[PDB]
Design an enzyme around this catalytic site. Structure first.
Site, PDB file in Angstrom:
ATOM      1  N   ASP A  33      63.660  78.891  67.950  1.00 23.11           N
ATOM      2  CA  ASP A  33      62.320  78.822  67.359  1.00 23.11           C
ATOM      3  C   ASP A  33      61.516  80.125  67.413  1.00 23.11           C
ATOM      4  OD1 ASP A  33      60.514  77.437  65.853  1.00 23.11           O
ATOM      5  OD2 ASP A  33      59.655  76.254  67.493  1.00 23.11           O
ATOM      6  N   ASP A  85      56.706  83.511  71.347  1.00 25.61           N
ATOM      7  CA  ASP A  85      56.470  82.298  72.138  1.00 25.61           C
ATOM      8  C   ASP A  85      57.415  81.909  73.279  1.00 25.61           C
ATOM      9  OD1 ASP A  85      54.684  80.570  73.276  1.00 25.61           O
ATOM     10  OD2 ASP A  85      54.872  79.003  71.762  1.00 25.61           O
ATOM     11  N   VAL A 109      59.447  67.846  68.754  1.00 27.00           N
ATOM     12  CA  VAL A 109      60.888  67.980  68.554  1.00 27.00           C
ATOM     13  C   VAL A 109      61.613  66.673  68.863  1.00 27.00           C
ATOM     14  CG1 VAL A 109      62.958  69.310  69.116  1.00 27.00           C
ATOM     15  CG2 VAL A 109      60.683  70.377  69.259  1.00 27.00           C
ATOM     16  N   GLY A 157      60.608  66.753  72.949  1.00 29.24           N
ATOM     17  CA  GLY A 157      59.472  67.459  73.518  1.00 29.24           C
ATOM     18  C   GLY A 157      58.388  67.751  72.506  1.00 29.24           C
ATOM     19  N   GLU A 158      57.318  68.390  72.971  1.00 34.39           N
ATOM     20  CA  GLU A 158      56.227  68.824  72.108  1.00 34.39           C
ATOM     21  C   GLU A 158      55.913  70.268  72.430  1.00 34.39           C
ATOM     22  OE1 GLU A 158      53.543  65.387  73.341  1.00 34.39           O
ATOM     23  OE2 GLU A 158      53.338  65.381  71.143  1.00 34.39           O
TER      24      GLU A 158
HETATM   25  O1  LIG Z   1      67.489  66.338  77.800  1.00 32.21           O
HETATM   26  C1  LIG Z   1      66.639  67.050  77.183  1.00 32.21           C
HETATM   27  O2  LIG Z   1      65.429  67.048  77.544  1.00 32.21           O
HETATM   28  C2  LIG Z   1      67.096  67.870  76.023  1.00 32.21           C
HETATM   29  C3  LIG Z   1      68.301  67.519  75.448  1.00 32.21           C
HETATM   30  C4  LIG Z   1      68.804  68.218  74.371  1.00 32.21           C
HETATM   31  C5  LIG Z   1      68.092  69.283  73.850  1.00 32.21           C
HETATM   32  N1  LIG Z   1      68.705  69.937  72.734  1.00 32.21           N
HETATM   33  C6  LIG Z   1      68.068  70.881  71.874  1.00 32.21           C
HETATM   34  N2  LIG Z   1      68.813  71.569  71.002  1.00 32.21           N
HETATM   35  C7  LIG Z   1      68.261  72.472  70.173  1.00 32.21           C
HETATM   36  C8  LIG Z   1      66.883  72.687  70.256  1.00 32.21           C
HETATM   37  C9  LIG Z   1      66.125  71.956  71.174  1.00 32.21           C
HETATM   38  N3  LIG Z   1      64.709  72.120  71.339  1.00 32.21           N
HETATM   39  C10 LIG Z   1      63.864  72.911  70.497  1.00 32.21           C
HETATM   40  C11 LIG Z   1      62.957  73.797  71.063  1.00 32.21           C
HETATM   41  C12 LIG Z   1      62.125  74.537  70.227  1.00 32.21           C
HETATM   42  C13 LIG Z   1      62.181  74.415  68.841  1.00 32.21           C
HETATM   43  C14 LIG Z   1      63.088  73.520  68.284  1.00 32.21           C
HETATM   44  C15 LIG Z   1      63.910  72.768  69.115  1.00 32.21           C
HETATM   45  N4  LIG Z   1      66.750  71.062  71.958  1.00 32.21           N
HETATM   46  C16 LIG Z   1      66.870  69.655  74.420  1.00 32.21           C
HETATM   47  C17 LIG Z   1      66.366  68.946  75.517  1.00 32.21           C
END
Ligand SMILES: O=C(O)c1ccc(Nc2nccc(Nc3ccccc3)n2)cc1
Length: 294
Positions: free
Chosen positions: A141, A123, A18, A11-12
């Site tokens: 985060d 946030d 990320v 994601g963003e």
């Molecule tokens: O299937 C998806 O879409 C998805 C799969 C795994 C996942 N795992 C994950 N684990 C730790 C952090 C994180 N996201 C994040 C959010 C904010 C700051 C840093 C990391 N995502 C997130 C989304």
């Protein structure tokens, strides 16, 4: 950099992009946040690094903090999915009420811990909340506001998402309190319940006015000091508070009362995480497991 292999982009966000990343050596799978610049403010590194010492079951572990080549990397333990994807996946059926209640309880536990240690998120949003197969949910985060702060966009060519932002932030207050995270969690709670965002503003003023249209335009009676805040204008239209019944149907009254305390205008009247945990809404709380499609 070459010590990983990107698997996917996750994601963003507000402060960066990320990725799901696999450590080339240990096989470890991590979440890797990349932030791109004069080079860096170095003051943050000490305090962002300090977050490596936040240890709690409802907080996503920050494994490392690395500043190299005009980049700042945050390495997080990997969870299975975020709440935004889960909610979208659940859009037709709905998240079962006991699961919503479990998630909210857990999120409050993580907040009460952070807040007791004087750490604010500032946030919160569904993309920042992560879940796993055994039924846990975790906040990720923190900092990254108290540390960096933000312009018209996130980092490069992405707008700031306003939907979860506390009114005191929108009104330009210079000093935030832990209450801002309670507001955000309240907006998220409503969204899990109804399956639509509570206040989906497309501009700062649109966000503010959507809040006012529902909860009533704040004044000195309900929020002492409001009319003296930096971005307050006497020209705001005056909307009367609507009946709360339309907000989270059909949640029960314990749920509605708790949400109403999370949505108080005056940060001083807004419920704390610790007090929220004692609300009668949680008397029957359990820990179900989600059905996740990974
Ligand atoms: O299937 C998806 O879409 C998805 C799969 C795994 C996942 N795992 C994950 N684990 C730790 C952090 C994180 N996201 C994040 C959010 C904010 C700051 C840093 C990391 N995502 C997130 C989304």
């Amino acid at each position: 950099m070459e010590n990983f292999q990107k698997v996917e982009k996750i994601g963003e966000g507000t402060y960066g992009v990320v990725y799901k990343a696999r450590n080339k050596l240990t096989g470890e799978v991590v979440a890797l946040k990349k932030i791109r610049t004069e080079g860096v403010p170095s003051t943050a590194i000490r305090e962002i690094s300090l977050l490596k010492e936040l240890n709690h079951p409802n907080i996503v572990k920050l494994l490392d903090v690395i500043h190299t080549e005009n980049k700042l990397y945050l390495v997080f333990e990997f969870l299975h999915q975020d709440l935004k994807k889960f909610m979208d996946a659940s859009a037709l059926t709905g998240i079962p009420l006991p699961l919503i209640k479990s998630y909210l309880f857990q999120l409050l536990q993580g907040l009460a811990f952070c807040h007791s240690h004087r750490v604010l998120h500032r946030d919160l949003k569904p993309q920042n909340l992560l879940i796993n197969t055994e039924g846990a949910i975790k906040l990720a985060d923190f900092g990254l506001a108290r540390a960096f702060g933000v312009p018209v966009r996130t980092y490069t060519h992405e707008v700031v998402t306003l939907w979860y932002r506390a009114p005191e932030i929108l009104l330009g207050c210079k000093y935030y309190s832990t209450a801002v995270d309670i507001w955000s969690l309240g907006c998220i709670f409503a969204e899990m319940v109804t399956r639509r965002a509570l206040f989906p503003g497309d501009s700062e003023i649109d966000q503010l006015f959507r809040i006012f249209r529902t909860l009533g335009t704040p004044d000195e009676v309900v929020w002492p000091g409001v009319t003296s805040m930096p971005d307050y204008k006497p020209s705001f239209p005056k909307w009367a508070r609507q009946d709360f019944s339309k907000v989270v149907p059909p949640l029960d009254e314990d749920g509605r009362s708790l949400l109403s305390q999370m949505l108080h205008y005056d940060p001083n009247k807004r419920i704390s995480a610790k007090a929220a945990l004692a609300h009668p809404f949680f008397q029957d709380v359990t820990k179900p497991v989600p059905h996740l499609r990974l």
